[PDB]
Amino acid sequence: EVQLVESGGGLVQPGGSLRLSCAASGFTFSSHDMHWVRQATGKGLEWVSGIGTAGDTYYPDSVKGRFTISRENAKNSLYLQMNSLRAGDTAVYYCARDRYSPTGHYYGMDVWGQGTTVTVSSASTKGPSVFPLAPSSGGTAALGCLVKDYFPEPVTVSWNSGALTSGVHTFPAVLQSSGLYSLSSVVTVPSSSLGTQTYICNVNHKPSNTKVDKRVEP
Amino acid sequence: TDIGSNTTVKTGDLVTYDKENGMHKKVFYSFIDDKNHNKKLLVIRTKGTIAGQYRVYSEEGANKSGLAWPSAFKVQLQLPDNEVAQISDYYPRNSIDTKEYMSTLTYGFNGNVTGGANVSIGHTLKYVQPDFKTILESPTDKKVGWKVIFNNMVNQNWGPYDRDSWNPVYGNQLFMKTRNGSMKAADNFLDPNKASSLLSSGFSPDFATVITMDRKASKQQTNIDVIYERVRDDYQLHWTSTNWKGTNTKDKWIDRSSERYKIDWEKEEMTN
Amino acid sequence: DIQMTQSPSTLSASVGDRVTITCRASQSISSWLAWYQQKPGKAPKLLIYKASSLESGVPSRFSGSGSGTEFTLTISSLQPDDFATYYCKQYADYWTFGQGTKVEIKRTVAAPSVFIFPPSDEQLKSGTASVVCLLNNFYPREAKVQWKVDNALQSGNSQESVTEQDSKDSTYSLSSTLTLSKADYEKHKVYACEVTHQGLSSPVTKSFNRGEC
């Protein structure tokens, strides 16, 4: 089976450097052009750099002079050296293989990896403050948790351990101007269950070993 | 009394050089008069050479230049519609993918020509088409044709390219000499002695077509047009500022050399 | 520096529909254009090359057309598997992707339920104060949320966040969060969230007073 596996990447200060790599398996690596392509959260695919089967390298202006792509056929592996990183370079970075016909007709990027995330930022790793969003009632009722000021992604949120997974909406995080992420998680429930049934939101942030359980009450 | 075949074969040649189209038409003709058959055959063998004429055609400055090169060679025979005579066989009979074609043509006795009990007519067809194919153009009883079209070519141990190859950086690399050479564009084309000889020297057809005529026909004089064609592409090279990039424009020029020949079935002659 | 613009950016359709996406280049690219499909948290799949040629795996309901500057992708009879994002990519001169076009699921208009949540007492002890407006389970995605504190409309001191189509009911939900300093928060009586949406015959307002809270 044909496969590509990216690795490397994680937090980097703006101005800093970092090195992605891609292990290729199940085909003759040396005989394909290869690419890096990136995608920032919520945004489109952006071509980042390419390398020909002969080791000739190709770059768009957005990264020219900052990134270098490389090849090492003996180790069936592709590399990306990223220098002078900036907030704008924050994204998931994929590895992709070109395929051609026997007579040099170009089909396209035929096979892709799973990606590896790069985050470029001044923010120091920090666990979230968690505040309740107390319910008033309106037929049914809404309640939630405000998961505020954490870095980097992700946080996981659950309700009553595994138990309450119906009517739940955990919103996509937002990068505040401070450099930290904020998010809310909400549920709707019967207004009749508010005086009886207890609601705890369980927030977990691995990058800081922060774990928090929060009682939401009227 | 005579127990041999009862067939005679009369063979001649018409040769014309068309200077302007770089074509050396060499036509052999052979009348087959099997006196035991109500019809009378003619074999027209089309040989000669269509020059390739692989040459720098255009130069827009140091940074752009176009190269005219031969993408196909054609030979076509056509009887007019009012003519009584008909096409009854042709060679090759079908497309040909091998690098060489060869067939020895014999007469098998009932207006039949094949490629023991046979009359040799003295024709062994032979030609070569390195990097090209032969396609037979829909034959009828008044028209037949072969086209010998470009198909495929390695370029200095780089992957076969063809007329539609595309690379997002170098474009079509068919006759690209170098990707980054600092020569001018007119100097950056592949030396033609690295490609098929069809591009440099050219193509030497060797096709045959057999025409039949009823003896009982008041008009015993047939006209026929023979066309030799060369179709050229325009392979362009330009500097992108960090490398050479090639483009190929299909079928931009067609050079065509036509002649009407007069067939006299009583004299068994064919004149220019 | 060949720009590629796809359009529309979002389109909604139901199964069976015949959808068409358009891609435009800022200069000629002949027929050197490809199309990709991408789904959430997965890698793209190649669909079409040379503007109309189908990649081997790909179902024949996909098809493409165009030359020069304008190109279209067309799904003759949309299937459940086809709701996704689609990207065109030029390869006449290096590689450039278009911005993408999301093909979403069409369903009937549905009004949001609107809840408002005052800032927690814990957060107030901190220093900032965050007031949250939730619009829950609505269609279509267009909605306006205005913040009013003592009836003064509010400058950009609030952020919104939106879910993708719920897998169960194909609706969206949205949060809008208004962040103030405790200083400012304590300076005004009434806080109100004003919502406007096709499924509501008038703007709904949810509000509260700091006083008795």
XYZ file of C-alpha atoms in Angstrom:
703
model
C 0.000 0.000 0.000
C 1.239 3.475 -0.969
C 1.791 5.856 1.957
C 3.234 9.166 3.130
C 3.803 10.068 6.781
C 4.710 13.620 7.804
C 6.395 14.349 11.142
C 8.162 17.181 12.991
C 6.547 20.488 13.859
C 4.859 21.951 16.885
C 5.309 25.241 18.708
C 7.861 27.753 17.435
C 8.535 31.376 18.323
C 8.174 33.815 15.431
C 11.628 34.313 13.971
C 12.525 30.682 14.718
C 13.200 27.553 12.650
C 11.816 24.044 12.294
C 12.078 20.892 10.197
C 9.345 18.672 8.778
C 9.977 15.285 7.235
C 7.990 12.737 5.264
C 8.555 8.982 5.103
C 7.366 7.399 1.866
C 6.542 3.733 1.415
C 5.027 1.319 -1.113
C 6.454 2.882 -4.296
C 9.645 4.081 -6.000
C 10.233 7.429 -4.251
C 13.144 8.606 -6.404
C 11.004 8.650 -9.548
C 8.246 11.124 -8.469
C 8.092 14.867 -7.971
C 7.069 15.698 -4.388
C 5.399 18.667 -2.723
C 4.582 20.311 0.541
C 1.074 21.904 0.739
C -0.367 23.690 3.741
C -3.780 24.560 5.134
C -4.459 26.973 7.992
C -7.430 26.167 10.250
C -10.636 26.881 8.435
C -8.868 28.026 5.231
C -7.824 26.722 1.809
C -4.965 24.623 0.486
C -1.786 26.605 -0.307
C 1.152 25.176 -2.341
C 4.336 25.700 -0.341
C 7.164 24.017 -2.194
C 8.025 21.379 -4.766
C 10.999 19.323 -5.806
C 11.659 17.607 -9.085
C 12.837 14.051 -9.510
C 16.318 15.459 -10.298
C 16.494 17.547 -7.081
C 15.521 20.883 -8.670
C 13.429 22.911 -6.268
C 10.379 25.092 -6.711
C 8.879 27.774 -4.456
C 6.116 30.375 -4.422
C 7.077 33.949 -3.459
C 5.324 33.733 -0.078
C 8.091 31.433 1.222
C 10.943 32.094 -1.206
C 14.189 32.728 0.682
C 12.735 31.323 3.921
C 11.966 27.628 3.289
C 14.070 24.911 1.728
C 12.762 21.632 0.393
C 15.125 18.616 0.094
C 15.245 15.011 -0.868
C 17.022 11.856 0.325
C 16.136 8.932 -1.889
C 18.245 6.426 0.092
C 15.934 7.010 3.072
C 12.794 7.409 0.913
C 12.166 10.733 2.630
C 11.289 14.347 1.853
C 12.153 17.345 4.041
C 11.179 20.974 4.627
C 13.495 23.346 6.463
C 11.456 26.331 7.646
C 13.356 29.429 8.745
C 12.186 32.872 9.786
C 8.712 31.605 10.632
C 5.812 33.991 11.229
C 2.232 33.761 12.572
C 1.046 33.479 8.935
C 2.932 30.175 8.540
C 0.729 28.544 11.174
C -1.098 25.652 9.544
C -1.243 21.928 8.881
C 1.552 20.904 6.442
C 0.936 17.978 4.096
C 3.243 15.945 1.922
C 2.115 15.004 -1.607
C 3.271 12.972 -4.605
C 2.845 13.958 -8.294
C 1.902 11.314 -10.801
C 2.596 11.439 -14.546
C 1.775 9.286 -17.549
C 4.521 7.201 -19.153
C 4.852 10.010 -21.755
C 4.947 12.958 -19.314
C 1.271 13.870 -18.992
C 0.588 15.364 -15.548
C -2.323 13.899 -13.558
C -1.754 15.741 -10.286
C -1.169 15.296 -6.583
C -2.100 11.679 -6.410
C -1.471 10.632 -2.840
C -1.250 12.726 0.302
C -0.165 12.331 3.893
C -2.237 13.003 7.042
C -0.438 16.283 7.804
C 1.611 17.652 10.691
C 0.722 20.821 12.537
C 2.972 23.821 12.955
C 2.073 26.676 15.289
C 4.121 29.851 15.213
C 3.508 32.228 18.082
C 4.790 34.272 21.039
C 2.250 32.717 23.406
C 3.456 30.553 26.255
C 1.698 27.272 26.939
C -1.156 27.966 29.358
C -4.133 26.080 30.706
C -7.693 27.444 30.405
C -9.782 29.349 32.934
C -13.242 27.701 32.933
C -16.367 29.695 33.778
C -19.946 28.431 33.929
C -22.619 29.733 31.617
C -25.476 29.595 34.039
C -29.042 28.742 32.831
C -31.999 31.067 33.493
C -36.647 29.548 30.880
C -37.879 29.330 27.204
C -39.371 25.818 26.728
C -36.086 23.974 27.156
C -32.927 25.454 28.679
C -29.384 26.132 27.627
C -26.228 26.018 29.714
C -22.527 25.748 29.026
C -18.901 26.395 29.899
C -16.693 29.252 28.808
C -13.196 27.772 28.264
C -11.053 30.884 28.222
C -7.413 31.839 27.580
C -5.503 28.676 26.779
C -2.605 27.894 24.460
C -2.026 25.955 22.300
C -4.877 23.870 20.860
C -6.595 21.534 21.609
C -8.923 21.349 24.595
C -11.438 18.560 24.871
C -14.785 19.126 26.507
C -17.280 16.565 27.754
C -20.420 16.700 29.808
C -21.154 14.519 32.819
C -18.206 12.346 31.744
C -19.431 10.365 28.708
C -23.016 10.589 29.808
C -24.453 13.722 28.191
C -23.622 13.829 24.487
C -26.950 14.970 23.102
C -27.650 18.582 22.152
C -23.996 19.383 22.759
C -22.136 22.000 20.717
C -18.510 22.741 21.304
C -17.670 25.751 19.217
C -14.503 26.081 17.176
C -11.862 27.932 19.145
C -11.013 31.555 18.432
C -7.597 33.143 18.651
C -8.022 36.242 20.804
C -5.790 39.288 20.280
C -3.786 38.208 23.350
C -2.572 35.132 21.425
C -4.710 32.698 23.450
C -7.692 30.596 22.332
C -11.241 30.882 23.728
C -14.210 28.610 23.244
C -17.638 27.745 24.628
C -19.402 24.449 24.927
C -23.146 24.334 25.299
C -26.057 21.964 25.817
C -29.781 22.233 25.673
C -31.850 20.228 28.135
C -35.405 20.091 29.479
C -36.159 22.993 31.809
C -37.768 20.400 34.142
C -34.408 18.626 34.682
C -32.695 21.784 36.051
C -33.896 21.362 39.665
C -32.989 17.643 39.724
C -30.197 16.643 37.305
C -26.613 17.945 37.854
C -24.453 19.277 34.995
C -20.636 19.125 35.113
C -18.415 20.098 32.209
C -15.111 18.260 32.027
C -12.356 20.279 30.392
C -8.985 18.701 29.567
C -5.940 20.485 28.151
C -3.070 17.983 27.545
C -0.356 20.536 26.612
C -0.462 21.853 30.203
C -1.813 18.786 32.115
C -4.754 20.958 33.086
C -7.891 19.096 33.987
C -10.987 20.913 35.314
C -14.511 19.805 36.222
C -17.080 22.598 36.584
C -20.473 22.549 38.131
C -23.039 24.629 36.273
C -25.930 25.825 38.456
C -28.794 28.337 38.109
C 0.722 -24.915 -76.501
C 1.451 -22.376 -73.713
C 0.849 -23.724 -70.173
C 2.496 -20.924 -68.200
C 0.808 -17.967 -66.592
C -0.878 -15.774 -69.092
C 0.120 -12.570 -67.388
C 2.483 -9.737 -68.303
C 3.851 -7.093 -65.982
C 4.984 -3.717 -67.340
C 6.843 -1.437 -64.929
C 8.049 2.164 -65.232
C 8.920 5.183 -63.073
C 7.997 8.846 -62.790
C 10.187 10.999 -60.618
C 9.622 14.614 -59.656
C 11.511 16.850 -57.318
C 9.408 19.578 -55.741
C 12.059 22.063 -54.657
C 9.731 24.397 -52.802
C 8.171 21.687 -50.605
C 11.402 19.702 -50.201
C 9.843 16.531 -51.628
C 11.338 13.937 -53.910
C 8.397 12.043 -55.341
C 9.345 8.719 -56.901
C 6.438 6.725 -58.249
C 6.754 3.244 -59.707
C 3.878 1.812 -61.733
C 3.227 -1.745 -62.823
C 0.421 -2.834 -65.155
C -0.731 -6.425 -64.671
C -2.315 -7.856 -67.777
C -3.642 -11.281 -66.854
C -5.166 -12.200 -70.219
C -7.373 -14.747 -68.413
C -9.152 -11.991 -66.493
C -11.829 -9.524 -67.597
C -10.159 -6.742 -65.591
C -6.691 -5.219 -65.767
C -4.688 -4.021 -62.735
C -2.239 -1.251 -61.950
C 0.018 -1.087 -58.945
C 1.178 2.393 -57.961
C 4.074 2.375 -55.569
C 4.736 5.704 -53.831
C 8.323 6.173 -52.670
C 10.829 8.996 -52.519
C 11.532 11.254 -49.597
C 9.661 13.973 -47.774
C 12.392 16.056 -46.142
C 11.867 16.639 -42.382
C 12.988 20.296 -42.263
C 13.612 20.577 -38.553
C 14.769 24.147 -38.268
C 14.651 27.246 -36.139
C 11.762 29.115 -37.738
C 11.335 32.175 -35.531
C 13.384 34.266 -33.114
C 11.674 36.983 -31.023
C 14.894 37.911 -29.211
C 17.352 36.117 -26.955
C 14.466 34.880 -24.830
C 11.999 33.301 -27.274
C 12.405 31.148 -30.388
C 10.287 28.725 -32.385
C 11.283 25.537 -34.087
C 9.316 24.093 -36.989
C 9.366 20.308 -36.873
C 7.509 17.569 -38.728
C 4.605 16.128 -36.763
C 3.271 13.990 -39.619
C 3.908 12.832 -43.199
C 1.033 11.875 -45.502
C 0.556 10.169 -48.851
C -2.885 10.185 -50.497
C -4.234 8.789 -53.757
C -7.506 9.949 -55.218
C -9.452 8.994 -58.313
C -12.088 11.517 -59.356
C -15.753 10.480 -58.836
C -16.666 10.280 -62.526
C -13.815 7.831 -63.204
C -14.736 4.248 -64.101
C -11.622 2.716 -62.434
C -11.534 1.575 -58.764
C -9.165 0.935 -55.870
C -9.068 -2.778 -55.070
C -6.121 -3.146 -52.625
C -3.549 -1.161 -50.647
C -0.412 -1.763 -48.621
C -0.081 -1.406 -45.682
C -3.638 -2.724 -45.275
C -3.805 -1.475 -41.720
C -2.057 0.645 -39.159
C 1.537 -0.171 -38.362
C 3.190 0.310 -35.008
C 6.496 -1.477 -35.582
C 9.616 0.479 -36.515
C 9.843 -1.220 -39.923
C 7.262 -2.228 -42.458
C 8.045 -4.825 -45.086
C 5.878 -6.787 -47.507
C 6.618 -8.611 -50.754
C 3.755 -8.211 -53.218
C 2.740 -11.005 -55.586
C -0.114 -11.534 -58.044
C -2.352 -14.495 -57.228
C -4.421 -14.588 -60.431
C -7.973 -13.256 -60.103
C -7.372 -9.568 -59.906
C -5.796 -10.570 -56.567
C -2.588 -9.163 -55.147
C -1.002 -10.609 -52.023
C 1.501 -9.215 -49.536
C 4.261 -21.719 -55.892
C 1.292 -20.546 -58.000
C 2.030 -16.804 -58.016
C 3.439 -14.236 -60.376
C 6.104 -12.022 -58.857
C 5.590 -8.384 -59.789
C 8.997 -7.317 -58.440
C 7.984 -5.129 -55.506
C 9.120 -5.519 -51.948
C 7.792 -2.594 -49.944
C 10.075 -1.434 -47.161
C 10.202 1.619 -44.882
C 11.138 2.763 -41.409
C 9.377 5.083 -38.953
C 11.469 5.362 -35.724
C 9.366 7.295 -33.137
C 6.329 7.440 -35.467
C 3.213 5.290 -36.254
C 1.408 4.618 -39.492
C -2.323 5.212 -39.556
C -4.424 4.184 -42.549
C -6.934 6.884 -43.576
C -10.461 5.608 -44.279
C -10.054 4.000 -47.684
C -12.775 3.884 -50.347
C -12.839 2.750 -53.970
C -11.715 6.243 -55.118
C -9.401 7.328 -52.282
C -6.796 5.850 -49.978
C -4.240 7.348 -47.643
C -1.608 6.719 -44.989
C -0.407 9.146 -42.338
C 2.833 8.618 -40.511
C 2.442 10.511 -37.283
C 4.787 11.416 -34.489
C 4.241 9.370 -31.435
C 6.966 9.409 -28.956
C 10.556 10.463 -28.125
C 13.218 10.109 -25.432
C 15.215 13.323 -24.987
C 18.784 12.791 -23.718
C 17.743 9.902 -21.440
C 14.814 11.808 -20.236
C 11.407 10.203 -20.137
C 9.615 9.815 -23.350
C 7.905 13.118 -24.192
C 5.280 13.728 -26.826
C 3.188 16.534 -28.347
C 1.029 17.040 -25.244
C 3.562 16.480 -22.434
C 3.320 19.155 -19.755
C 5.369 20.020 -16.696
C 4.240 22.934 -14.568
C 7.785 24.282 -14.515
C 9.416 23.358 -17.828
C 6.245 22.943 -19.891
C 6.613 20.663 -22.858
C 10.210 19.401 -22.891
C 10.152 17.536 -26.247
C 13.096 19.342 -27.878
C 14.449 21.209 -24.868
C 18.215 20.960 -24.818
C 18.767 22.450 -21.381
C 16.583 23.687 -18.540
C 18.912 26.481 -17.474
C 21.370 27.031 -20.305
C 22.543 30.629 -20.629
C 22.549 30.492 -24.425
C 19.906 32.277 -26.449
C 16.657 30.506 -27.207
C 17.548 29.726 -30.868
C 20.575 27.806 -29.515
C 18.602 25.823 -26.947
C 16.966 23.207 -29.186
C 17.862 19.545 -29.283
C 20.361 18.609 -31.937
C 18.325 16.777 -34.626
C 20.822 13.925 -34.773
C 19.676 13.052 -31.249
C 16.080 12.579 -32.462
C 14.448 10.363 -35.069
C 16.042 10.595 -38.498
C 12.525 11.424 -39.740
C 12.957 14.865 -38.197
C 16.322 15.575 -39.886
C 16.620 13.604 -43.127
C 12.880 12.966 -43.377
C 10.567 10.124 -44.309
C 10.754 7.746 -47.236
C 7.357 6.334 -47.929
C 6.958 2.964 -49.525
C 3.219 2.380 -49.960
C 1.340 0.489 -52.656
C -2.149 0.834 -54.045
C -3.804 -1.400 -56.646
C -6.282 -0.037 -59.183
C -8.550 -2.142 -61.393
C -10.083 -1.400 -64.812
C -12.701 -3.261 -66.777
C -11.492 -4.103 -70.272
C -14.975 -3.399 -71.682
C -15.071 0.354 -71.001
C -15.254 2.920 -73.824
C -13.022 5.316 -71.864
C -9.648 3.647 -71.287
C -7.970 6.710 -69.755
C -7.938 7.432 -66.031
C -6.681 10.445 -64.105
C -5.454 10.196 -60.594
C -4.090 12.699 -58.108
C -1.214 11.823 -55.799
C -0.490 14.018 -52.787
C 2.607 14.061 -50.576
C 2.093 16.187 -47.433
C 4.258 17.363 -44.533
C 2.584 18.752 -41.388
C 4.784 20.776 -39.046
C 4.324 21.811 -35.376
C 5.776 24.947 -33.783
C 7.798 24.126 -30.664
C 8.492 27.369 -28.809
C 11.011 28.020 -26.008
C 11.043 31.023 -23.706
C 12.935 32.194 -20.671
C 10.599 32.495 -17.533
C 13.391 34.300 -15.882
C 14.584 31.216 -13.814
C 14.498 28.610 -16.577
C 13.529 27.492 -20.053
C 9.931 26.535 -20.718
C 8.679 24.890 -23.887
C 5.299 25.008 -25.618
C 4.165 23.022 -28.644
C 1.554 24.306 -31.128
C 0.033 21.415 -33.132
C -0.346 21.459 -36.935
C 0.562 25.088 -37.513
C 1.832 24.523 -41.098
C 0.908 22.029 -43.784
C 3.129 21.660 -46.874
C 1.313 19.895 -49.710
C 2.592 18.664 -53.100
C -0.026 17.418 -55.533
C 0.207 15.934 -59.012
C -2.260 14.588 -61.520
C -1.047 11.549 -63.425
C -2.587 10.243 -66.643
C -3.120 6.463 -66.954
C -3.432 4.918 -70.438
C -4.736 1.353 -70.047
C -4.285 0.444 -73.733
C -0.685 1.722 -73.981
C 0.028 0.559 -70.381
C 1.685 3.932 -69.718
C 1.410 6.527 -67.006
C 2.535 10.056 -67.773
C 3.403 13.145 -65.812
C 1.158 34.980 -9.246
C -1.697 33.465 -11.131
C -4.749 34.162 -8.942
C -7.555 31.580 -9.060
C -11.058 32.608 -7.950
C -13.712 30.009 -7.325
C -17.331 30.834 -7.256
C -19.635 30.516 -5.601
C -17.814 30.154 -2.264
C -20.772 28.290 -0.739
C -23.593 26.447 -2.410
C -26.390 24.375 -0.950
C -28.036 21.482 -2.723
C -29.947 18.299 -2.046
C -29.214 14.810 -3.297
C -29.984 14.392 -7.000
C -29.261 18.054 -7.783
C -26.956 18.976 -10.615
C -24.341 21.333 -9.157
C -21.784 23.429 -11.005
C -18.729 25.170 -9.600
C -16.767 27.783 -11.487
C -13.075 28.602 -11.386
C -11.465 31.689 -12.943
C -7.779 32.364 -13.582
C -6.233 35.841 -13.750
C -4.548 34.889 -17.065
C -4.763 32.064 -19.576
C -3.833 28.598 -18.360
C -4.933 26.668 -21.470
C -6.520 23.519 -20.112
C -3.912 22.993 -17.346
C -6.452 22.883 -14.524
C -7.206 20.197 -11.944
C -9.999 19.666 -9.369
C -9.797 18.209 -5.857
C -12.325 17.141 -3.248
C -11.578 17.600 0.488
C -13.571 16.582 3.575
C -13.190 17.808 7.189
C -9.960 16.610 8.755
C -8.983 14.500 5.709
C -6.615 14.844 2.787
C -7.621 15.929 -0.695
C -8.537 13.510 -3.500
C -7.710 14.258 -7.138
C -10.797 14.306 -9.321
C -10.027 15.889 -12.690
C -6.953 16.796 -14.717
C -6.496 18.706 -17.947
C -9.828 20.545 -17.267
C -12.067 17.619 -18.253
C -10.165 14.332 -17.823
C -11.290 12.033 -15.041
C -8.781 10.549 -12.614
C -9.002 6.741 -12.481
C -10.994 6.030 -9.251
C -13.501 8.807 -9.825
C -17.300 8.355 -10.460
C -18.506 9.437 -13.915
C -21.082 11.895 -12.517
C -18.105 14.229 -12.114
C -17.070 16.090 -15.254
C -15.281 19.312 -16.182
C -14.945 21.846 -18.939
C -13.132 25.010 -19.954
C -10.066 26.557 -21.505
C -8.101 29.740 -21.067
C -9.591 31.569 -18.129
C -12.966 30.079 -17.072
C -13.522 26.473 -15.987
C -16.393 24.556 -14.478
C -16.778 21.417 -12.433
C -20.137 19.720 -12.610
C -21.684 16.904 -10.630
C -24.505 15.589 -12.804
C -26.455 14.012 -9.905
C -25.131 14.904 -6.435
C -24.759 12.031 -3.938
C -24.401 12.006 -0.137
C -20.697 11.333 -0.493
C -20.246 14.533 -2.528
C -20.992 17.132 0.182
C -17.495 18.537 0.684
C -15.134 21.294 -0.233
C -13.809 21.488 -3.830
C -10.639 23.132 -4.982
C -9.472 23.984 -8.437
C -5.735 24.021 -9.101
C -3.901 25.589 -11.971
C -0.628 23.989 -13.237
C 0.171 26.046 -16.288
C 2.880 27.768 -14.262
C 3.913 26.179 -10.985
C 0.832 25.369 -8.868
C -2.020 27.492 -7.489
C -5.199 26.404 -5.737
C -8.410 28.369 -5.693
C -9.813 29.477 -2.347
C -12.314 26.568 -2.249
C -16.076 26.080 -2.615
C -18.138 24.344 0.114
C -21.078 22.246 -1.082
C -23.523 22.159 1.843
C -26.781 20.354 2.543
C -30.018 22.138 1.850
C -32.935 21.840 4.303
C -35.858 24.046 5.346
C -35.427 27.400 7.008
C -35.184 27.025 10.826
C -35.141 29.794 13.421
C -32.502 29.864 16.151
C -33.406 29.698 19.836
C -31.610 32.550 21.539
C -30.152 32.319 25.045
C -28.040 34.896 26.844
C -25.562 34.227 29.601
C -24.200 36.846 31.917
C -20.551 36.811 33.035
C -19.900 34.380 35.917
C -18.991 35.754 39.382
C -15.657 33.878 39.231
C -14.675 35.657 36.039
C -15.657 39.004 37.505
C -13.277 38.358 40.431
C -10.552 37.916 37.813
C -10.870 41.225 35.964
C -12.449 40.740 32.542
C -16.167 40.086 31.978
C -17.651 37.983 29.170
C -21.285 38.040 28.070
C -22.338 35.231 25.737
C -25.168 34.999 23.231
C -26.010 31.561 21.875
C -28.069 31.016 18.685
C -28.890 27.356 18.613
C -29.849 25.007 15.781
C -30.720 27.313 12.882
C -30.787 27.296 9.068
C -29.476 28.947 6.942
C -26.118 30.162 8.249
C -26.906 33.893 7.756
C -27.680 35.654 11.025
C -27.020 39.067 12.560
C -26.178 39.542 16.217
C -26.081 43.027 17.689
C -24.948 43.811 21.187
C -26.595 46.621 23.089
C -25.658 47.848 26.522
C -27.967 50.602 27.734
C -29.188 50.671 24.101
C -25.851 51.846 22.665
C -25.019 49.601 19.760
C -21.581 48.103 20.139
C -18.242 48.552 18.352
C -16.082 45.513 17.508
C -15.569 44.191 21.036
C -17.152 40.827 20.387
C -16.339 37.682 18.449
C -18.559 35.017 16.904
C -17.980 31.323 16.274
C -19.981 28.868 14.159
C -20.393 25.110 13.975
C -20.494 23.221 10.726
C -23.754 21.593 9.664
C -24.862 19.299 12.441
C -24.771 15.722 11.182
C -28.192 14.966 12.651
C -30.384 17.965 11.597
C -28.125 19.864 9.146
C -28.434 23.094 11.177
C -25.801 25.547 12.321
C -25.271 27.079 15.738
C -23.431 30.245 16.623
C -21.992 31.904 19.674
C -21.260 35.574 20.070
C -19.098 36.641 22.964
C -18.779 40.225 24.202
C -15.643 40.883 26.285
C -15.403 43.908 28.614
C -13.210 44.857 31.567
C -14.910 44.531 34.960
C -14.525 48.321 35.180
C -16.723 48.915 32.102
C -19.076 46.013 32.771
C -19.984 47.455 36.166
C -20.724 50.864 34.534
C -23.942 49.853 32.678
C -27.317 48.431 33.794
C -28.816 46.388 30.959
C -27.104 44.055 28.496
C -28.924 42.816 25.406
C -28.376 40.508 22.456
C -30.371 41.371 19.285
C -30.758 38.619 16.663
C -32.043 38.802 13.094
C -32.644 35.752 10.937
C -34.884 34.712 8.034
C -36.824 32.219 10.213
C -37.772 34.950 12.706
C -40.566 37.276 11.681
C -38.933 40.025 13.772
C -35.662 40.649 15.652
C -35.567 38.722 18.906
C -33.885 40.451 21.855
C -32.605 38.631 24.951
C -31.293 40.703 27.833
C -30.594 41.017 31.542
C -29.725 43.517 34.252
C -26.652 43.241 36.442
C -29.141 44.248 39.215
C -30.610 41.045 40.697
C -28.050 38.784 38.986
